[PDB]
Each structure stands twice: as C-alpha cells, then as structure tokens.
Amino acid sequence: EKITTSKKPNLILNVDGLIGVAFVDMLRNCGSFTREEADEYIDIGALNGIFVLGRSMGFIGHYLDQKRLKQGLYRHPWDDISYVLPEHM
Amino acid sequence: WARELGLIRKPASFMTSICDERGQELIYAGMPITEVFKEEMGIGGVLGLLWFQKRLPKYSCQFIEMCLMVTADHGPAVSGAHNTIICARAGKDLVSSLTSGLLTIGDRFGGALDAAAKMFSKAFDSGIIPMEFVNKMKKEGKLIMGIGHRVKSINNPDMRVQILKDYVRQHFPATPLLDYALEVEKITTSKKPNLILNVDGLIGVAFVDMLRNCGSFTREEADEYIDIGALNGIFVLGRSMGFIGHYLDQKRLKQGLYRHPWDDISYVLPEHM
Amino acid sequence: WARELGLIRKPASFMTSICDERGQELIYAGMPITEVFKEEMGIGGVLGLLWFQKRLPKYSCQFIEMCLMVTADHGPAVSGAHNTIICARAGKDLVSSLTSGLLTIGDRFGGALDAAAKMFSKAFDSGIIPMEFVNKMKKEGKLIMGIGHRVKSINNPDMRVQILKDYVRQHFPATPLLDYALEVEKITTSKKPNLILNVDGLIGVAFVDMLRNCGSFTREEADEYIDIGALNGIFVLGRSMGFIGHYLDQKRLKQGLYRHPWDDISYVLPEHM
Amino acid sequence: WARELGLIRKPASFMTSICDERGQELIYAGMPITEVFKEEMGIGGVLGLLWFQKRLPKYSCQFIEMCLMVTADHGPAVSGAHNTIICARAGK
Amino acid sequence: GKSTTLFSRHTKAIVWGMQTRAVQGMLDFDYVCSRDEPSVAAMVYPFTGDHKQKFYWGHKEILIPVFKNMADAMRKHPEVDVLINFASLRSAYDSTMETMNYAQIRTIAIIAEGIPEALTRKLIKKADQKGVTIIGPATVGGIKPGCFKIGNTGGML
Ligand SMILES: CC(=O)SCCNC(=O)CCNC(=O)[C@H](O)C(C)(C)COP(=O)(O)OP(=O)(O)OC[C@H]1O[C@@H](n2cnc3c(N)ncnc32)[C@H](O)[C@@H]1OP(=O)(O)O
Ligand SMILES: CC(=O)SCCNC(=O)CCNC(=O)[C@H](O)C(C)(C)COP(=O)(O)OP(=O)(O)OC[C@H]1O[C@@H](n2cnc3c(N)ncnc32)[C@H](O)[C@@H]1OP(=O)(O)O
Ligand SMILES: O=C([O-])CC(=O)C(=O)O
Ligand SMILES: O=C([O-])CC(=O)C(=O)O
C-alpha cells in the first residue's frame, strides 16, 4: 500500500484487506495453530464467516427497522428498468 | 413531471429481456401471452421463451417437459429432500422448506447434469475418440460424470433413461453428442456392466445436443447457456416439484420436530481446549 | 446383518408417500414412471401424483399446466424478481439467486393466491350472498383479496384471466365457487370498474373449485390441501421459471454489482445515541 | 446535474435509521464508529445501536453478549444444525 | 353557530382517504404561500393500518400520520377543525355523520359526486343542528389564497 498509494492516493488498504491479512496473521502467529491448520481455515472458509456474522447483526437491524417504520411492498420504478425484449420470438 | 415531458435523463439499471408487463398484455420474449396460449406451447415453450428467449420447435418443448418429469422426484433419502423434510417437519412455511432443500442442490447433489454436459462437450469438441477419452479420464484420476449406476446395469436399464433416449432418437434430427456419450457408455460397460449412462448424464448430453442441434442457436449461444447454468436450472425446476410434494406430504402426515439419534453421531471433541 | 435376518427392530422415521426410489422403477404415487409416460400425462399429471397423490383427470392436469404458465413471470420490477436480479448480479449461483428471490414469496408478494382462495371459500361455505360478503368486508375494514387491478378494468380484460376463465368454463364440470367469485366481481365492478378478478384470485378460486368439484377428493382432502398450502406451492413453482429466467438473463447480459443510489434512501438516523 | 443544483424532486424510498456510510465515518445510531470503539462498548453495544438504536447501559450490553454465548451451539442432532451439516456435507 | 372565518393560516385539516396527490398539492400550496405549518395534520384510511406517509414540505421530507380510525386521529390532533372527505358516493354519508359527531370539526368538504339527495338533505339537517359548514356535496373545494386550499382546487402549482 505504499507502492499503490503512490499511484493513485485512494488506493489504500480497505477494511477487507486489513481484516483478511490480520486474521491470517493471528491464525498463523498467535501460538495455537500450526500453519497448515492455519491454512485450512483460510481455505475451508473461515473468513467468510466473520464477514457473514458481522453483516448478520446489521441485516437483522434493517429488518427490525423496516418493521418499526412499517414500510410496504416495494414495486421497482419502471423508469429504471429499460426492457430490451426481442422483436418477436 | 419533468420526465413525462422529457427535460431530464436518468440512467436505467436492471436491463431485462424475458418479460414486459407494462402494456396491454404480458409479453415473454416478444410473444404476447395470448399468442403463447393460442399456439398451444406448454411449459416447455415458456421455458424456451423465458430462459432462452426463443420459440423452440415442438420436439424441443416436449423434451424439456420430459426431462422436467423425469427429474421431478427421486425419493426422500436424497440430501435435498432430506433438508426439505426436516424443515417442513419443523413447522416452517412452504417457501422456507423448499428453499432449505433447494440450497443443497450444488456440485455433489444435483451437479451431475451440468458437469456431465460440460465434460462430454469438452471431450467431444476437442476431437478425442471415446476410447481415448475414457483413458484420459482414468489417467487424471477422475471419474466420468453421468456414467455409473448402483444397481440397474444390463438387460436391466434405467427404464427412464430408456424413455428419454427413445424420445431423442425418434424426434431429434441429429445427435452427435448423444452418440459419443453412448460410445463411452459401451466402453465403460465393457469395463463394468453397471457403468451405464445416468439420467443425470443423458439429460445433460441430450440438452447440449438439443441446444446446438436444433435451430435458433448459433453454437456461441448454445455454448454460453451451458456455461451460465441452464442445466442447473432444469434440475432445480424439476426437483422443486418433488420438494414441494415432500413438504405437502410431511405437513399432511402431521409429523413433529425431528431430532437426530445421538447414537448416529459420534462426538470426537478434543480432550480439553 | 441382524436386520437382514430380522432379529431386531428399529423405529423408522420420515414416513413418505410421494416417491419410491428403490426397486425396479421410480414410483410416484403407485404408478410407475413408465406408466406415467405411457399415459401421456404431462407436468400437471406429475403434480397430481406428487402433490395430491392422485391420478387427476386430463382437464385438471391441463389446467394445472395452464396456471403454471400464467404465473411464470410478471416482469422484473416485482419484489421477488428484484431480489433474484440483485443476487444474480452479485455473482452468485443459480440456486442462491433463485432462492433469494423465492424467499420473498410470502403474504404480501405472492400471497394473493392462497388468501383469495381461503377468503372466497370461507365466504361461500358459510352461505353468504355476494352482496352481503362485499358489505361484510367493507364493514370489517378489509379489502377482498383476488379483486382489484391497477389499469385493465372493463372492455379491457386481463387477457390471461380471460384464457383461464374460458378453460374453466368449457372444461370444468361445475364451478360453484367461480360463479360466486364472478358475482362478487360484478358487484365490485359496479363499485369501481377496475375491481375485476385478478389472475391471483381466479387461479385461487378455480383451483379450489377443481379440487372439490372433480373426483378423487372428499372435501376433507380438498379443504386440507388448501390449508396446507398447495396454492403457495403453485405460485412458487410457476414463478421459479421466471426467476431462473431472470438469473440467466442477468448472467448473460454480464452485469455487475448493483449498489443502490444514496439519493433514494433518506437516512433518518437519531441525533446522537 | 439537475439534482446537484436542486431544480427537481424525487421521492426517496428505503427509509433507514441504523447506519450511515455517506460521510467521513461510519455512524451506527448517531455515534461514529470511533466513538463506538473509544467507549469500549462491545458486540452487545453494537446490537444496542443497530437493533434498538440506543446506547444501552453496560450491564445490558454484557447480558446481550452472555445470551449470545449461551445460545451459540447445542450440538449437531438438533434440526437446524442437522440441515447445516447436510448442506455442508454436500459441498456447498 | 356557523363561523365567518372558515380558513386561517393556523387551519389544519384531516383528509379522509388515500389521496396522496391531493395532499401533496395542498402541501405545495402551503409552502408557496409562506405558511409555517402544513395544513394536513393526518389522513384517515380505514382499509390499512396506522403508519406514516412521506410527503414534501418544499424541499424537505415530512411524515404525515395515516390512521385507520377517525377517533384516534381526532384525539391525537385536537386542534384540527377541517375535514376533507374524499370518500366515494356510497361512503360519504356515514363518514360525514361520524365526523360531525366530533365537535372540533368546524367544516367538512365533501368531494364525492353522486350522493342521493335524501342523504344529502339528512347531512344538511344534521350539520345545521351541529353548526358545521358542509362546503358542497359535489365540489372540488374552496381556495383561500395565502391561507388554505381544499384538495385539488386550483390545480397544480
Ligand atoms: C470362490 C471365489 O470367489 S475365489 C475367486 C478368486 N478370484 C477373485 O477373488 C476375483 C474377484 N475380484 C475381481 O475380479 C474384481 O476385479 C475386483 C473386486 C478385484 C475389482 O473389480 P472391479 O469392481 O471391476 O474394479 P473397480 O471397482 O476398480 O472398477 C473397475 C473399473 O470401473 C471404473 N469406474 C468405476 N466408476 C466409474 C465411473 N463413474 N466412470 C468411469 N469409470 C468408472 C474404474 O475406473 C475401474 O477402471 P479400471 O478397471 O480401468 O481401473
Ligand atoms: C372538473 C371537475 O373535476 S369538477 C367535478 C367535481 N366533482 C368531483 O370532484 C368528484 C370526483 N371524485 C369522485 O367522485 C370520487 O368518488 C372520489 C375521488 C371522491 C373517490 O372515488 P373512488 O376512487 O371510487 O373511491 P375509493 O377509492 O374509496 O373506492 C371506491 C370503493 O372501492 C372499494 N375497493 C377498493 N379496492 C378494493 C378491493 N381490493 N376489494 C374490495 N373493494 C375495494 C372501496 O371499498 C370503496 O368502497 P366504498 O365505495 O363502498 O367505500
Ligand atoms: O441427481 C443427483 O445428482 C442425485 C440423485 O438424484 C440420486 O440420488 O441419484
Ligand atoms: O402475484 C403477486 O401477488 C404480485 C404480482 O405478481 C403483481 O405485481 O401483480
């Protein structure tokens, strides 16, 4: 991120990147896993479990919200579709 | 108001090309629903219009209907039907139960359709004879998808592979890929007599053959609809009938919460973490 | 080994009655797959066998197919197709996209089928004339489900309510409930001209009428299949075609991640919590 | 362009009140993410902010954490864990 | 006891029905007339639950409560004195009676066209008994510039 923030300046380490790298480095350098265990966990999919878990709170909080605000069925604006159907099939 | 008289522009997302409900009638591809019903095309016809956006010939529509019927159900011991039964037996709604059973349809359960079609198409398009394709699968340590049955082997056919195969022979004009798959079947049945074409493999090869053998597809559309996942779609749509049937069955038999026997678990927990 | 010679007993859970995978042939209700294909019953026939466990008459099978075709798709703006397009446009698999769109099918989207059938059945079974049912619904502060269209009102029919209605008239033997629904439609169109029967209401009343008007149902089975949710099942199975079509469309158009515009949100967060 | 100078109106759907990402910092209820972390309020606190939109007292946050930990798992034989095991064992 | 000042700049109204176009027109008229508060305090729709409708106050978004009953709408807004009855020709009569059972409502504007004349005469009699001013059981409304505007009268801005 020093080599890439030299290029454009907004090319910094995103929260994704940071969590990713810091979890690979807590899994590998903390004392409990053995760098093969700690590389199964990365592959089986244990970092998509962190993201999922986190989002889950926010997701539920957007259910609990739109239910407190009593919002109704959403019919998408049709001016925001642009049907491109074929001529006659 | 500013858009009705058109002094402003907004970019429209969600390009769509399979249905138009704004207007006098529903239009699936370019075909009004009244014309859909007047030309007597069935469910296969509306899969042709919605999925592939084409007015398929009559035999293609009837074959799509046929492969939906053979896929409809294969008993409750299967993993997806197991999940549907478990969720239906926990008091959940139809959509949740069907959904929980559908979420299993992937690579290991329900993936033989698309995998068998991809494998046979890649073998056939690269000009490998069946005797060399079988050996090249063997050298790679890979089994041929779409070939292999547990019990019904020889003078004991799948009895629904036979129905589909007969339909393909009498009605399709040309089957370059089904013939290749049948040669591979002959070789593998010479190996072991129960290595016949699955229904999961015959539907895959016959659907690829229908896409690139009938009209209206240009072999760059036919090879794209396979990659996108139209065969996963056929398996899911066919097996939704069986999963909803299992939901209705378990909900009509009035059966309560399932709790797996502890004797069929085996807890291998660590000593003290 | 101990069960093969039968010296032991284990209780079997998961009673099932819609498919027999084991044995020589697939058996849906009691009728093997070869007989299913030889008797030329289509997808409607296998819904009869798997869902209701009965060999329905030909017009019932064709009507089930018809109501699957009318339900297949209704454009991308509706909520479920919106979810399918959003999830397909985020790079997910067919099953995940169809599943995320199906999970919307509930009471507010897709619930007019079963609700309209339940409401009209409870009206007709309790011996209320249509003019008193309309006034009771008005008195209770409740709208009639299955009645009401946005635009297509009079000398402007739904053009697919017309097709279904014509099929029901020319082929069903007796329609005590469709006639009641049409009288309620006459009253409500006297009120306001776009309060015609929906397709969502006509399918519901015609399906209840088919269940309790054709043979093989005892009105204790016909009234149970409505309560269990067979009409939710028909909507889900019909709309799966449209949702998979939307997945294939959005995946063929090669469209990328959708992020909602910030100017269409109106954040209303508290001041400082 | 016509909305930047504001000669037009469009009604905005999706009223939301649990997060705002448009701006300098993430804001959960009304308090920025930096204030969330500086006040040492944990996962129970961010459930308080996102779900109930309130800065709950410390004991309620710790109780929310506690009831999340007791709920975490109850073996594989129960129905939901059965479905998760079946679907995970099918390669999904 | 019919009053002479029907509409003031402090007048607020209760709109009977989902007439969001008419209520938006009223709010636009209120804003362009330099009024400090909207003239629509609540809306009454018997066919849906109690929620809030999102409207415009010039540029701003405001929330106008929608009630299922007339009673709770009347109690939560005790200073409302005008009711604009957007009911149909077969539901304006009983709605107008129920409104006139509330003493705070000083005028009712009935927009429905086609009420039978016997029911209209009953409305007139009970309004005269209760001192309420019914502005026309076939009208579009009455517009008092700078002050108030009933429904769709005048048109769009
Ligand atoms: C009284 C007495 O019994 S004493 C008699 C003494 N004699 C004996 O005991 C002999 C009995 N045993 C045998 O003959 C058998 O050959 C056995 C048991 C050793 C093994 O037989 P098989 O089951 O045919 O072997 P296997 O299970 O490997 O399968 C055979 C082939 O099927 C192939 N195959 C299996 N599934 C698939 C698939 N899905 N796709 C493609 N190929 C497949 C395998 O690649 C294998 O290929 P290969 O033969 O080229 O390696
Ligand atoms: C130039 C000029 O314009 S000056 C002319 C001056 N005159 C006027 O302005 C008159 C114009 N306005 C009217 O006449 C109209 O009647 C209005 C706008 C006041 C209201 O009309 P409508 O839209 O018919 O009323 P509404 O929306 O309440 O619907 C009518 C009925 O449909 C019923 N309805 C609606 N949806 C459903 C449903 N899904 N199921 C059952 N019933 C339903 C409602 O119950 C209502 O019943 P009710 O009449 O028994 O209460
Ligand atoms: O189709 C599949 O992949 C799984 C299946 O039905 C079977 O058990 O044979
Ligand atoms: O069927 C439904 O309930 C929703 C629907 O398709 C529509 O927008 O008309």
CSV table of N, CA and C in Angstrom, one decimal, chain B residues 65-141:
chain,number,residue,atom,x,y,z
B,65,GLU,N,-40.2,-30.7,-21.3
B,65,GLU,CA,-41.2,-31.2,-20.4
B,65,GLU,C,-40.8,-32.6,-19.9
B,66,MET,N,-40.4,-33.4,-20.8
B,66,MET,CA,-40.0,-34.8,-20.4
B,66,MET,C,-38.9,-34.8,-19.4
B,67,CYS,N,-37.8,-34.0,-19.6
B,67,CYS,CA,-36.7,-34.0,-18.6
B,67,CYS,C,-37.1,-33.3,-17.3
B,68,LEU,N,-38.1,-32.5,-17.3
B,68,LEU,CA,-38.6,-32.0,-16.1
B,68,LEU,C,-39.4,-33.1,-15.3
B,69,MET,N,-40.1,-33.9,-16.1
B,69,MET,CA,-40.9,-35.0,-15.4
B,69,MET,C,-40.0,-36.1,-14.8
B,70,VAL,N,-38.9,-36.4,-15.6
B,70,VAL,CA,-38.0,-37.5,-15.0
B,70,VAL,C,-37.3,-37.0,-13.8
B,71,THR,N,-37.0,-35.7,-13.7
B,71,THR,CA,-36.3,-35.1,-12.6
B,71,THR,C,-37.1,-34.8,-11.4
B,72,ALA,N,-38.4,-35.0,-11.5
B,72,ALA,CA,-39.4,-34.4,-10.5
B,72,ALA,C,-39.0,-34.9,-9.1
B,73,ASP,N,-38.9,-36.2,-8.9
B,73,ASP,CA,-38.5,-36.7,-7.6
B,73,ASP,C,-37.7,-37.9,-7.7
B,74,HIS,N,-36.9,-38.1,-6.7
B,74,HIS,CA,-36.1,-39.4,-6.6
B,74,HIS,C,-36.1,-39.8,-5.1
B,75,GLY,N,-37.2,-39.8,-4.4
B,75,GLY,CA,-37.3,-40.3,-3.1
B,75,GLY,C,-36.8,-39.4,-2.0
B,76,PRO,N,-37.1,-39.7,-0.7
B,76,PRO,CA,-36.8,-38.8,0.4
B,76,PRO,C,-35.4,-39.0,1.0
B,77,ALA,N,-34.7,-40.1,0.7
B,77,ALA,CA,-33.4,-40.3,1.3
B,77,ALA,C,-32.4,-39.4,0.8
B,78,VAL,N,-32.6,-38.8,-0.4
B,78,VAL,CA,-31.7,-37.8,-1.0
B,78,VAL,C,-31.5,-36.6,-0.1
B,79,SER,N,-30.3,-36.0,-0.3
B,79,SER,CA,-29.9,-34.9,0.7
B,79,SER,C,-30.9,-33.7,0.6
B,80,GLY,N,-31.2,-33.3,-0.6
B,80,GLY,CA,-32.1,-32.1,-0.7
B,80,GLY,C,-33.5,-32.4,-0.1
B,81,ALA,N,-34.1,-33.5,-0.5
B,81,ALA,CA,-35.4,-33.9,0.0
B,81,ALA,C,-35.3,-34.1,1.5
B,82,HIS,N,-34.2,-34.6,2.0
B,82,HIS,CA,-34.0,-34.7,3.5
B,82,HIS,C,-34.1,-33.3,4.1
B,83,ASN,N,-33.4,-32.3,3.6
B,83,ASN,CA,-33.5,-31.0,4.2
B,83,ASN,C,-34.9,-30.4,4.1
B,84,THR,N,-35.6,-30.6,3.0
B,84,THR,CA,-37.0,-30.2,2.8
B,84,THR,C,-37.9,-30.9,3.9
B,85,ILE,N,-37.7,-32.2,4.1
B,85,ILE,CA,-38.5,-32.9,5.1
B,85,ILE,C,-38.2,-32.4,6.5
B,86,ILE,N,-36.9,-32.2,6.8
B,86,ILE,CA,-36.5,-31.7,8.1
B,86,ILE,C,-37.1,-30.3,8.4
B,87,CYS,N,-37.1,-29.4,7.4
B,87,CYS,CA,-37.6,-28.1,7.6
B,87,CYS,C,-39.1,-28.0,7.6
B,88,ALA,N,-39.7,-28.9,6.8
B,88,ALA,CA,-41.2,-29.0,6.8
B,88,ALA,C,-41.7,-29.5,8.1
B,89,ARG,N,-40.9,-30.5,8.7
B,89,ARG,CA,-41.3,-31.1,9.9
B,89,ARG,C,-41.0,-30.3,11.1
B,90,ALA,N,-40.3,-29.1,10.9
B,90,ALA,CA,-40.1,-28.1,12.0
B,90,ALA,C,-41.1,-27.0,11.9
B,91,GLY,N,-42.2,-27.2,11.2
B,91,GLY,CA,-43.3,-26.2,11.2
B,91,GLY,C,-43.1,-25.0,10.3
B,92,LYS,N,-42.1,-25.0,9.4
B,92,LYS,CA,-41.8,-23.8,8.6
B,92,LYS,C,-42.7,-23.8,7.4
B,93,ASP,N,-42.8,-22.7,6.7
B,93,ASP,CA,-43.6,-22.4,5.6
B,93,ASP,C,-43.2,-23.2,4.3
B,94,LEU,N,-44.0,-23.2,3.3
B,94,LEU,CA,-43.6,-23.9,2.1
B,94,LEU,C,-42.4,-23.4,1.5
B,95,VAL,N,-42.3,-22.0,1.4
B,95,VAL,CA,-41.1,-21.4,0.8
B,95,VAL,C,-39.8,-21.7,1.5
B,96,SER,N,-39.9,-21.6,2.9
B,96,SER,CA,-38.7,-21.9,3.7
B,96,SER,C,-38.3,-23.4,3.5
B,97,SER,N,-39.2,-24.3,3.5
B,97,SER,CA,-38.9,-25.7,3.4
B,97,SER,C,-38.3,-26.0,2.0
B,98,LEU,N,-39.0,-25.6,0.9
B,98,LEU,CA,-38.5,-25.8,-0.4
B,98,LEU,C,-37.1,-25.1,-0.6
B,99,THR,N,-37.0,-23.9,0.0
B,99,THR,CA,-35.7,-23.2,-0.1
B,99,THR,C,-34.6,-23.9,0.6
B,100,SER,N,-34.8,-24.5,1.8
B,100,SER,CA,-33.8,-25.2,2.6
B,100,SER,C,-33.4,-26.5,1.9
B,101,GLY,N,-34.3,-27.1,1.2
B,101,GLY,CA,-34.0,-28.2,0.4
B,101,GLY,C,-33.3,-27.9,-0.9
B,102,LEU,N,-33.6,-26.7,-1.5
B,102,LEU,CA,-33.0,-26.3,-2.8
B,102,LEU,C,-31.6,-25.9,-2.6
B,103,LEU,N,-31.3,-25.3,-1.4
B,103,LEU,CA,-29.9,-24.8,-1.1
B,103,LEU,C,-28.9,-25.9,-1.1
B,104,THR,N,-29.3,-27.2,-1.1
B,104,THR,CA,-28.4,-28.3,-1.2
B,104,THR,C,-28.0,-28.6,-2.6
B,105,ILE,N,-28.8,-28.3,-3.6
B,105,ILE,CA,-28.5,-28.5,-5.0
B,105,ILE,C,-27.3,-27.8,-5.4
B,106,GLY,N,-26.2,-28.5,-5.7
B,106,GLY,CA,-24.9,-27.9,-5.9
B,106,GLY,C,-24.1,-28.7,-6.8
B,107,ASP,N,-22.8,-29.0,-6.3
B,107,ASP,CA,-21.9,-29.8,-7.1
B,107,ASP,C,-22.0,-31.3,-6.8
B,108,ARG,N,-22.3,-31.6,-5.5
B,108,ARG,CA,-22.3,-33.0,-5.1
B,108,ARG,C,-23.6,-33.7,-5.2
B,109,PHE,N,-24.7,-32.9,-4.9
B,109,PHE,CA,-26.1,-33.3,-5.2
B,109,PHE,C,-26.7,-32.4,-6.2
B,110,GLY,N,-27.1,-33.0,-7.3
B,110,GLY,CA,-27.7,-32.2,-8.4
B,110,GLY,C,-26.7,-31.6,-9.4
B,111,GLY,N,-25.4,-31.8,-9.2
B,111,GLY,CA,-24.5,-31.3,-10.1
B,111,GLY,C,-24.0,-32.2,-11.2
B,112,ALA,N,-24.6,-33.4,-11.3
B,112,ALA,CA,-24.2,-34.3,-12.4
B,112,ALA,C,-24.7,-33.9,-13.8
B,113,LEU,N,-25.8,-33.2,-13.8
B,113,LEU,CA,-26.3,-32.7,-15.1
B,113,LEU,C,-25.3,-31.8,-15.8
B,114,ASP,N,-25.0,-30.7,-15.2
B,114,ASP,CA,-24.2,-29.7,-15.8
B,114,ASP,C,-22.7,-30.2,-15.9
B,115,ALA,N,-22.2,-30.9,-14.9
B,115,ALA,CA,-20.9,-31.4,-15.0
B,115,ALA,C,-20.8,-32.5,-16.1
B,116,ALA,N,-21.7,-33.3,-16.3
B,116,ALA,CA,-21.7,-34.3,-17.3
B,116,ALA,C,-21.8,-33.7,-18.7
B,117,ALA,N,-22.6,-32.7,-18.8
B,117,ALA,CA,-22.7,-32.0,-20.1
B,117,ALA,C,-21.4,-31.3,-20.4
B,118,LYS,N,-20.8,-30.6,-19.5
B,118,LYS,CA,-19.5,-29.9,-19.7
B,118,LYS,C,-18.4,-30.8,-20.0
B,119,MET,N,-18.3,-31.9,-19.3
B,119,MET,CA,-17.3,-32.9,-19.6
B,119,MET,C,-17.4,-33.5,-20.9
B,120,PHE,N,-18.6,-34.0,-21.3
B,120,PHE,CA,-18.8,-34.6,-22.6
B,120,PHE,C,-18.6,-33.6,-23.7
B,121,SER,N,-19.1,-32.4,-23.5
B,121,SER,CA,-18.9,-31.4,-24.6
B,121,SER,C,-17.4,-31.1,-24.8
B,122,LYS,N,-16.7,-30.9,-23.7
B,122,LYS,CA,-15.2,-30.6,-23.8
B,122,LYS,C,-14.5,-31.8,-24.5
B,123,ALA,N,-14.9,-33.0,-24.1
B,123,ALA,CA,-14.2,-34.2,-24.8
B,123,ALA,C,-14.6,-34.3,-26.2
B,124,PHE,N,-15.8,-34.0,-26.6
B,124,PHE,CA,-16.2,-34.2,-28.0
B,124,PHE,C,-15.7,-33.0,-28.9
B,125,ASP,N,-15.7,-31.8,-28.3
B,125,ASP,CA,-15.2,-30.7,-29.1
B,125,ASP,C,-13.7,-30.7,-29.4
B,126,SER,N,-13.0,-31.4,-28.6
B,126,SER,CA,-11.5,-31.4,-28.8
B,126,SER,C,-11.1,-32.6,-29.6
B,127,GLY,N,-12.0,-33.4,-30.2
B,127,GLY,CA,-11.7,-34.4,-31.1
B,127,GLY,C,-11.0,-35.6,-30.5
B,128,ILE,N,-11.4,-36.0,-29.3
B,128,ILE,CA,-10.9,-37.3,-28.7
B,128,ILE,C,-11.9,-38.4,-28.9
B,129,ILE,N,-11.4,-39.5,-29.4
B,129,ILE,CA,-12.3,-40.7,-29.6
B,129,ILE,C,-12.7,-41.2,-28.2
B,130,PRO,N,-13.8,-41.9,-28.1
B,130,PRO,CA,-14.2,-42.4,-26.8
B,130,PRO,C,-13.2,-43.2,-26.0
B,131,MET,N,-12.5,-44.1,-26.8
B,131,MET,CA,-11.5,-45.0,-26.1
B,131,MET,C,-10.4,-44.2,-25.6
B,132,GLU,N,-10.1,-43.0,-26.1
B,132,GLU,CA,-9.0,-42.2,-25.5
B,132,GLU,C,-9.5,-41.2,-24.5
B,133,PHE,N,-10.8,-40.8,-24.6
B,133,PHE,CA,-11.4,-40.0,-23.5
B,133,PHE,C,-11.5,-40.8,-22.2
B,134,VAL,N,-11.9,-42.1,-22.3
B,134,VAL,CA,-12.0,-42.9,-21.1
B,134,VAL,C,-10.7,-43.0,-20.4
B,135,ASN,N,-9.6,-43.3,-21.2
B,135,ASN,CA,-8.3,-43.5,-20.7
B,135,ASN,C,-7.7,-42.2,-20.2
B,136,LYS,N,-8.1,-41.1,-20.8
B,136,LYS,CA,-7.6,-39.8,-20.3
B,136,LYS,C,-8.3,-39.3,-19.0
B,137,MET,N,-9.6,-39.7,-18.8
B,137,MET,CA,-10.2,-39.6,-17.5
B,137,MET,C,-9.5,-40.5,-16.5
B,138,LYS,N,-9.2,-41.7,-16.9
B,138,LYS,CA,-8.5,-42.6,-16.0
B,138,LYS,C,-7.2,-42.1,-15.5
B,139,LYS,N,-6.4,-41.6,-16.4
B,139,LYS,CA,-5.0,-41.1,-16.1
B,139,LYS,C,-5.1,-39.9,-15.2
B,140,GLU,N,-6.1,-39.1,-15.3
B,140,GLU,CA,-6.3,-37.9,-14.5
B,140,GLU,C,-6.8,-38.2,-13.1
B,141,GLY,N,-7.1,-39.5,-12.8
B,141,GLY,CA,-7.7,-39.8,-11.5
B,141,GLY,C,-9.1,-39.2,-11.3
